[PDB]
């Protein structure tokens, strides 16, 4: 069963690597979208405050 053990252990590692890559990709995409929304809200806040000082 040696060949079986090698294939299964490598397959486990491949699954873990796939999960690690998927989580990295999702984290980057989430960071991008969060930065967009946060910048939008900061621009809105700054514009509102500039509109209030006048």
* Residue number, 28 or 42, with CB nearest to Mg ion: 28
In whole angstroms, how far apart are CA 13 and each of 9, 23, 42, 52? 6, 15, 43, 58
Q: Which of 8, 15, 16, 38 binds Mg ion (CB under 5 A)?
A: 16
22 near Mg ion, rule: CB under 5 A: no
In the complex, residue closest to Mg ion by CB: 16
- The token pair at 23 is 């989580």
30 near Mg ion, rule: CB under 5 A: no
Binding site for Mg ion (CB under 5 A): 16
């Amino acid at each position: 069963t040696l060949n079986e053990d090698i294939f299964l252990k490598h397959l486990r590692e491949r699954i873990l690597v796939l999960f690690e890559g998927l989580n990295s990709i999702k984290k980057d995409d989430l960071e991008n979208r969060l930065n967009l929304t946060i910048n939008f809200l900061e621009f809105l806040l700054a514009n509102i405050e500039d509109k209030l000082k006048k």
